[PDB]
Amino acid sequence: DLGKKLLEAARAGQDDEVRILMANGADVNATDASGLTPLHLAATYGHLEIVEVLLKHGADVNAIDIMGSTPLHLAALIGHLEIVEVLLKHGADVNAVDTWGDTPLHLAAIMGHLEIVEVLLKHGADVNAQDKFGKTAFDISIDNGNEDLAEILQK
Amino acid sequence: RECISIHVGQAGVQIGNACWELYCLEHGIQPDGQMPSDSFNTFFSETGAGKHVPRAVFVDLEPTVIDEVRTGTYRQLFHPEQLITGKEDAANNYARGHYTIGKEIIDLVLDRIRKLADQCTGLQGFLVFHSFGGGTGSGFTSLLMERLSVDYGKKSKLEFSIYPAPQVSTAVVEPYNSILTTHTTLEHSDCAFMVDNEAIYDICRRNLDIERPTYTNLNRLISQIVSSITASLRFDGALNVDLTEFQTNLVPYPRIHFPLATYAPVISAEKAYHEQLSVAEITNACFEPANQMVKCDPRHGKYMACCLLYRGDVVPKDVNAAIATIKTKRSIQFVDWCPGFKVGINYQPPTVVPGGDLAKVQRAVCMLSNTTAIAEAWARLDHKFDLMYAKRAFVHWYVGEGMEEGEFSEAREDMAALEKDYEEV
Amino acid sequence: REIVHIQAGQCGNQIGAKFWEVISDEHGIDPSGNYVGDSDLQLERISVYYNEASSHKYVPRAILVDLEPGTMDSVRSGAFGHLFRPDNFIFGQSGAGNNWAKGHYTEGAELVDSVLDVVRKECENCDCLQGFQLTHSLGGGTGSGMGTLLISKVREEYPDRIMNTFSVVPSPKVSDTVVEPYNATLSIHQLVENTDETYCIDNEALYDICFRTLKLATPTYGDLNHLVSATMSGVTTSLRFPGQLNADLRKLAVNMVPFPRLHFFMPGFAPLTARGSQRALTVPELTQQMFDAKNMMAACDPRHGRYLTVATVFRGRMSMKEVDEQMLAIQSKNSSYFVEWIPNNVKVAVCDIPPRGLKMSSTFIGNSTAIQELFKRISEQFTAMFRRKAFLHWYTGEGMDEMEFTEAESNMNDLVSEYQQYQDATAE
Ligand SMILES: C=C1NC(=O)[C@H](C)N(O)C(=O)[C@H]([C@@H](O)C(N)=O)N(C)C(=O)[C@H](C)OC(=O)[C@@H]2C[C@H](C)CN2C1=O
Ligand SMILES: Nc1nc2c(ncn2[C@@H]2O[C@H](COP(=O)(O)OP(=O)(O)OP(=O)(O)O)[C@@H](O)[C@H]2O)c(=O)[nH]1
Ligand SMILES: Nc1nc2c(ncn2[C@@H]2O[C@H](COP(=O)(O)OP(=O)(O)O)[C@@H](O)[C@H]2O)c(=O)[nH]1
Ligand SMILES: [Mg+2]
Asked: C325: number of CA atoms within 13 Å, CB side?
């Protein structure tokens, strides 16, 4: 099955093997057992060119795994700024909510990815969105004493 | 009729340094043991060469304090085998001093004590100096006292103990150590004289005009009190002639064995021409709470015994008159079941130590009172103990050093009963 | 008497090297091992940290450990790099790749026995070994994974000796990777069980001090390490010079650790200075500042919690009366922040010898329940990563199971709940 091979190639960052697999009918929207797609894995592990290739060939930019994670959630969590920008350019939902109630803004705020926080805000990230404990990204920055983040969130 | 002095831990050793400094001067003995010119034989052996040697043992679980004795002014005074040190101290942990670390050296200490005791023709007992707050002073003293009771069942044992003061302290757990050692030593001690470090500190500040007293300042003042208490043992004594008489005169019941010491006059050496104070004046000062060795209010308590030990130019009739006047005072109440003041006079004036902070005086007095008011000092310790023990704060340090957790509550219950003993009398 | 110092990984060797530079200058030991000092106080306790070799030479009782060789080369390049015992450099070649699993189970395990031999040799040479001091980061792979492996092995071989750590906690503000919360949480689990005393050196705090208080636009590791070395000098002063209070590792622990798991200290000091900076503070200023949240080396606000215990050390010629007055004043005016069920829980020492470049300094060591804020911040980052299973293959591929992650996180959250319990407790 070419789906599994494309998932592994996208995770592993093998640009050449990704192209060959898609040229042979690989399901660009294949899922592993948890619902992750090749775009999810390339977004997680920083493979910008594979992200770009997949989005040009039918990948669902807003696909969710079984926990509600989108590719943008994972890029915002891991801190891949260019991938965040490319996903947003291709219509990623900036306020997608996962099963924990987290939005991309929450995850970038928790992990201190301040440049990504600013990008997400400029693209309409919801500063009032609450996780399942009632916390907004601003609450996280106040509770953890991250003054730099709090200032970005207030501008 | 020999007495053996045992100095345990830093406080015990440093107080011992000052006590033997003073004893030597009182008896004309030089730091090398020689004497230019006997009653002092109770406290000093004599070699075949005219060298007089303290009947004294110094013990500590680390070496730094006793190493100063071994190399300082008195490096030739003591038996070098009676200066005994381990390598690693009790870390302010009673359980280390008593159970783990202390047990590595207890047999050696007892064998060296036996060497001294075998030199005695009529050993009376032991004087044991130590802090409450340190791990050696608390835990190793307790172990030593337990062992001495077994090995010397008929011998008396007196303590000089340092009661802790937060403002001059080196451990948060000093209340634990104080209660643990009091619990295990109570059965084994015949009489214990406590000195509150805050009380002596404030006497040094107020009466000696010393802004920042040192341990040396405190210890030289303590040594004057100790010397008054033991003068009867070292000179021709009519009162408190032997150790047995301290219990007779001061301790009506074995558990209530903590007399309050008060000493007067304490005058700065910078006032060399002070007006000399009368017998009445120094005796009256023994009933002012600010001259006491332990912070408490004897006007809130009852006296069970009172001994007045005078030194110097003191005429007996003047003592009897001074006592007559204070007997009239309403603030001095005795229990119904006791006679009464006991009086001793030593006609030599107190000795002045070169380097000391005290002015020479022509007369002085040390009052030893067994007053129920000292229970106030037990209550202060018990309260700090209770606050920490309710949360088991620091208890794991003791349980990890050979002690069962139940010893804490057993010790505290013994203290509750001790406080009750004071209330009942 | 003797302390055996170990420094593991890149962070651990960099701050360790700086420690030995700073205290060597304080004790008058030059880069060759010769004493060129001015005062008898410098040598009185020199054996705590230094072996005395042939011909009045002084050699740090220091063991240098790393899975990457490049660090050992840079240590040797430093001012005091050649003062260390060459046989006490123990270094692999593979590296750990910022992977706790590699440090703790794979390449680190293969190097650890070689480290324990050198530890054994230093220890058998001691008159009376006090215990061990380890410098490391928690966010990498060698200092974190192999450092904690080293701790558990030393603990097994030396169960009666004190284990103290200077542990550098990761922050996104100074980060190489998002797996740092994994590595830190796995390590904290180990430190909770196997150390007696841990100084929480928080890169978040170090960055905040440099950026905001010292106005350094882009802090370097040298900038951060200037704060670490001043802290390490200050908190070891009572161990290195003669004194009455906290004069060895076990007396410090007995005064600072009322419950065995709650042994994570918040350090602080005053004045805070940048490298090259230049009026000596008063005792009131020293006292106010070393208790200020802005002067803490852990990114926690003490006023959000309660002090279980505190040690402070003033350094320099100054009025002992003023020290006691100011120390009493901070407690009486802020009495609610000191737990009432540990009476007299703040102790103060004074050392006449000031650190380099200052006439007056003060160092704070707090055991405060507010340190839960540090563990909560790491926990939240750990949980955000672990919920999405990001990068877990790097750990399970070295043999670990996911359950080690869950147990590490559960133990750290239990630590947090314990702090909050004593924060809320009352005397009644
Ligand atoms: C050196 C002194 N003080 C200090 O070194 C510190 C700064 N200090 O002022 C304290 O209060 C603390 C402690 O008591 C506390 N923090 O509560 N501390 C450790 C002492 O006091 C120690 C035990 O005292 C001495 O060693 C001598 C004994 C003499 C009778 C008076 N001394 C001092 O004043
Ligand atoms: N009066 C007086 N008190 C002292 C002296 N030295 C220490 N202390 C007091 O003794 C208590 C601390 O115990 P230490 O005697 O120093 O401890 P230790 O017996 O050596 O036991 P560890 O060191 O724990 O093994 C505190 O209350 C100190 O204030 C001294 O020379 N004179
Ligand atoms: N303060 C400080 N932190 C450092 C230093 N070097 C690395 N770190 C931090 O340590 C973590 C990386 O661990 P590192 O020591 O480099 O990995 P190791 O060599 O595998 O132990 C991150 O939190 C870095 O910020 C340093 O010199 N000083
Ligand atoms: Mg001691």
From this structure: 10
